[PDB]
């Protein structure tokens, strides 16, 4: 619930659950616990709910590569504790 769960020695949690965190330019970070086929959009919308952001205003990158809402933990090959980076993005309309 509001507690932190142990995970030492556990690769994957029951039916392919793994955790990722998303960190902004400003050093603000939220983590999420997500399943392997589930799109990155789910954590992104959750980020907006928790940490007070608008979804079209934020876009995610992995090491200088754009990652898109249709992309995934399977597709980007995310870990049990992944780290994903945010840029605040001008969308032109």
């Amino acid at each position: 619930m509001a507690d932190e769960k142990p995970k030492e020695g556990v690769k994957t949690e029951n039916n392919d659950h793994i955790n990722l965190k998303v960190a902004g330019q400003d050093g603000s970070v939220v983590q999420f616990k997500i399943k392997r086929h589930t799109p990155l959009s789910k954590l992104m919308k959750a980020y907006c709910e928790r940490q007070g952001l608008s979804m079209r205003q934020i876009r995610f990158r992995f090491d200088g590569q754009p990652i898109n809402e249709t992309d995934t933990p399977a597709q980007l090959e995310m870990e049990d504790e992944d780290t994903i980076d945010v840029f605040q993005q001008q969308t032109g309309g």
């Binding site: 509001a2 939220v30 999420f32 616990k33 399943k35 589930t38 789910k42 980020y47 928790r50």
Partner: peptide, 11 residues
């Protein structure tokens, strides 16, 4: 421990 998400059923 922040976000446990779902759009798939939980398990």
């Amino acid at each position: 421990g922040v976000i446990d998400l779902t759009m798939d059923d939980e398990e």
